[model samples]
Target: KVFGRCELAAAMKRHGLDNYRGYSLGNWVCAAKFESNFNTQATNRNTDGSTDYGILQINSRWWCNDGRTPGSRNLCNIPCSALLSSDITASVNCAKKIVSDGNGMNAWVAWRNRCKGTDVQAWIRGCRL
Candidate 1:
């Protein structure tokens, strides 16, 4: 369910982020792409054999504390696991919540400040993903 421009616009509105433009998904997608190549099931390993799991590459040691099977708020601290496993609408809603709460850019700002006219690469680099 990779969101394109129009769908990204819909996601912005779904969260009451009406001011969003085109490109807001760029940052998130860039980060996701660089981090996991957009692979929701991806998992990584550190030198110590610890695991960094899921699309967002959240370290299991920290995020896994949330729970299994996803969609549970207990897993909110994880990365994209909950999003990947949860329904698409719910996943978008959760992402909006994170950005709305200042975790990053609100969908609007993310669109305006990064997405629309901005280079997606800038956002990925800024996040250092």
Candidate 2:
């Protein structure tokens, strides 16, 4: 949680989220809280009963579902979810990419969009990166 929080805080700060007063970071945190309960190893069963893994809850199989080799940086376990990789940077980048690709955070967005529109900076402010 410390590592992931640092990564998130840094990313949020870089994106001008230094204030604990808005939707973007707050929503992001809220989404993560719901998706993984902040657990890096979280896995959820999809409506189709498929597995969703990691803090961001991306499925390893989804990353490999294209029938391509799943070892590449962008196509494999490294990018599937935050838990499977040691590098939080990789996971953060992947999360950003996935959110954009999936039209604004997808499941993450859905979770954040419902965060009572409150500031969650206290949860994110401890990070200094």
Candidate 3:
């Protein structure tokens, strides 16, 4: 609900996410597409009894409070619902921290499966940003 690919590119540029950790904007865009199709309100139940939250599908086990889940690492110190909104500032910040923890965009399986080594330029094609 936040942005289409072009707008997302601009937004990511503004947030300095286009090249964080040496990953391309297209890399992040590819991950976001496969993870939630750019839907900010997205959530998914995992087989491990945890849930993925928001556009990047951040794991509740490590990042956010899902209310019903206990023993959350909550490295982001944010409520899960915060990630489920059109304003992605919190999620972006949390994502930066997650990447800085050394996984880069590899923390997102979608990136590994769908984007790694693929020509992902189309993910941001036609975006003026």
Candidate 4:
């Protein structure tokens, strides 16, 4: 696991993700909780034969290459393994691109389902960063 909620916020802040592209740090925190539970090495195989990877659970179909995965688009021009490191810099950078492309945090289904329209500030409680 990469961070407890507040530490994740601090890390994201250090990486320039606090209020990144207009999304709050709490939004990222909540999404991360549902997506991968802050586990950088998390992976989920989908019924569509694709997979979701890393702290953000970015998809093989759209974001990263899972070499030999039949439907990988690799839109982020990175290997899926790149998102699975304890170092979150690459994942955050790629996610910034994805958000900049107009998806916002909605690019993540976890965000849409759990964080959107919710009171997300509690995610940053006890950590002042």
Write one digit per residue (lDDT tens) for candidate 3, span 7-57.
777777788888888878998888888998988998999887789999899
- In model 3, which runs have C-alpha deviations exceeding 4 angstroms? none
Candidate 2 residue-wise lDDT, 1-129, digit = tens? 433666755654565543323235656666667677666656666665445666566654444232333432345445344444443454455565565554564435446565545665556667665
Q: Write down the TM-score of every candidate.
A: 0.42, 0.56, 0.94, 0.93
Candidate 4, superposed: residue stretches over 4 Å from native? none
The lowest-lDDT stretch of 10 consecutive residues in candidate 2 is 64-73
Q: Give the deviation of candidate 1 from the true structure as CA RMSD.
A: 8.8
Worst 10 residues of 1 by lDDT: 66-75
- Greater-TM-score candidate between 1 and 2: 2
For candidate 3, list the clashing residue pairs, or say none: none
Among residues 3 or more apart in sequence or in different chains, the pairs in candidate 1 whose N, CA or C atoms overlap within 3 Å are 23-115, 66-74
Candidate 2 structure lDDT: 0.53
Query: Which should have the higher lDDT, number 1 or number 4?
Result: 4
User: Taking the tens digit of each residue's C-alpha lDDT, what string does model 4 give over 40-127?
Assistant: 9999998888888888888888889988579568888999999999999888988888889887888898899889999888898889
How does model 4 score by TM-score? 0.93
Per-candidate clashes come to: 2, 0, 0, 0
Give the CA lDDT, 0 to 100, for residue 1 in model 4.
59
- Candidate 3 lDDT for residue 41: 90
> Model 2: runs farther than 4 Å from truth?
1-23, 60-82, 109-113, 125-129
Off by over 4 Å in 1: 1-23, 66-118, 121-129
By TM-score, rank the candidates, best first: 3, 4, 2, 1
